[PDB]
Design an enzyme around this catalytic site. Sequence first.
Site, mmCIF file in Angstrom:
data_model
loop_
_atom_site.group_PDB
_atom_site.id
_atom_site.type_symbol
_atom_site.label_atom_id
_atom_site.label_comp_id
_atom_site.label_asym_id
_atom_site.label_seq_id
_atom_site.Cartn_x
_atom_site.Cartn_y
_atom_site.Cartn_z
ATOM 1 N N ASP A 1 -22.065 -19.283 26.268
ATOM 2 C CA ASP A 1 -22.654 -19.963 25.121
ATOM 3 C C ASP A 1 -23.056 -18.918 24.084
ATOM 4 O OD1 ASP A 1 -22.379 -22.368 26.545
ATOM 5 O OD2 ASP A 1 -24.414 -22.198 27.379
ATOM 6 N N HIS B 1 -26.995 -25.162 29.985
ATOM 7 C CA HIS B 1 -25.599 -24.766 29.826
ATOM 8 C C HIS B 1 -24.640 -25.922 29.474
ATOM 9 C CE1 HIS B 1 -22.036 -22.300 31.585
ATOM 10 N NE2 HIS B 1 -22.326 -21.883 30.366
#
Lengths: 313, 313
Positions: A150, A177
């Site tokens: 990410d 996530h």
Amino acid sequence: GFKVAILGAAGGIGQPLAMLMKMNPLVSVLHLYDVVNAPGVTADISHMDTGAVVRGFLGQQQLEAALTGMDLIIVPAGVPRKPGMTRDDLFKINAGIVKTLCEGIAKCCPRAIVNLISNPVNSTVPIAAEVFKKAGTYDPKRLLGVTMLDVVRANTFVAEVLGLDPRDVDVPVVGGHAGVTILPLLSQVKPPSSFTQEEISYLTDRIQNGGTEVVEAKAGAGSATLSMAYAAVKFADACLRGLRGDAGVIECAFVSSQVTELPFFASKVRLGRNGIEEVYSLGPLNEYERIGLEKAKKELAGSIEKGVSFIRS
Amino acid sequence: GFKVAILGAAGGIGQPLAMLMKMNPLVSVLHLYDVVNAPGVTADISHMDTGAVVRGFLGQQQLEAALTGMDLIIVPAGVPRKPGMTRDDLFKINAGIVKTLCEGIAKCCPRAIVNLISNPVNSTVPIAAEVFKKAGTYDPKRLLGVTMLDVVRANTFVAEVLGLDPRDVDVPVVGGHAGVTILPLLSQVKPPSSFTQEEISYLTDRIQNGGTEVVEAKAGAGSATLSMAYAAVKFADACLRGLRGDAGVIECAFVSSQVTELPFFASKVRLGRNGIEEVYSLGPLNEYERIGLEKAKKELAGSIEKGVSFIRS
């Protein structure tokens, strides 16, 4: 150097990941483990003229051998999404998988740093923690959910909007996530920058859904594997530099924390000789981020319970 | 920043090779081409927070856009080692692929340095040469067959024997890229070492059959992909450092030469601003290697013709 084990080394993410670890000069020993094709991947990798010595392990009967003595365990293990998956029946498989591997870890290398990539990370990390708790080997300083991809995406997309080099951008990403759980703190990006309202929303939404960008590009047949491997290695390398004793090794990861009312959260963490040396607080957030934080937490609370529940029953 | 295009970036070798090139700071632009899945891989890779900007190109209709402007073209393209079908000679196929790609290269980026990995290099390179000759763009200084994986294996195997870190070992490998045509000059090994006749035998044999070793391990359904991507990137990077103007960039490669009677041969070469800035002769050879040299040339002559006749006839 350090001894690293990669569980699920023959999969889409595993292979490029093992190739990159074999290249890491901080890795002295590399154990590739999987339930299939482990030997062929090992063979291939063994030919690379780098420092790390690699060995392969196939099946449950060899997990103990693969894990014993390891300093770091990278775990991308997990079954893909093929027969019109998302069937949740998937999650049960993956949770089952993270479960046994963690049982093995708890038994063979209870002190090893663990980099869990197995998705959904928001649930599998709690799963791991619970399994370790039940085994009496849980050290919340040694369990990390790899959320690095990410940060990589954020850095890349932010750099694109700012017309900068991705290598010169750092975007803190907190929360979880998955989806709206992913919260990039644009107000804390480096170098100092200002974003128009338009860019803030475009960026955040893009970062949160970067995953489907790749699934779309692959007609829903697959998902990110290379960038994932690249990210896991950048993160593993960070943990290794931490074990070596380097100072100021900071990266975002999904870890056991008290930075919010939730037991597991993603934030900046300092990596050291025994894993996590410090979990950084969220600090000042702007309106946009605050509203996003709350939405993140709401979904994250549920995902954590889902994982905690899977084991505690 | 150099522009690099990878032809066949969606395959076993191509994907990891594409990920590694994306990581290479000398790469400003990276073009991923293939007849299938190029978009997916590209999306995957585009998320990596590195300098190279990446674009995808799918099908013949997009090959020209991929090639135009490129400084370097890495060509791993080619069909896989189908386990079932022993060998209705992949040659026909690969050779076909190589020809069309080379035609494209001769038309779109005639001045591009070329790194042909397409198996069998012993033939495909001469094919490429014949394709460029007819096109009137042939520059023997710009075409290189990647034999780098023969050197990688040698360093590894030799270092194993010597009990050294493969990174501190150099083994020049000359000749061709298959069986007895691969000739590892153990007498020129660095550091200076001595080997027993057995080791010399084992090493020479294992280096010459390295590929087979992996296919066997992968249960006939596949061959070295990762170690190949690794070696291809190391080789590609050398060329880039050459293009940059670096001094002392020497690597073994199957190129056009008059080191022997044959039109093509693998030997040390110096990479400069225009590709190959010099082709070095073989140097000192013991009797064992001179004998090996003869066998090499013997089988190599045919291979070269098998490829040249693919275009001439």
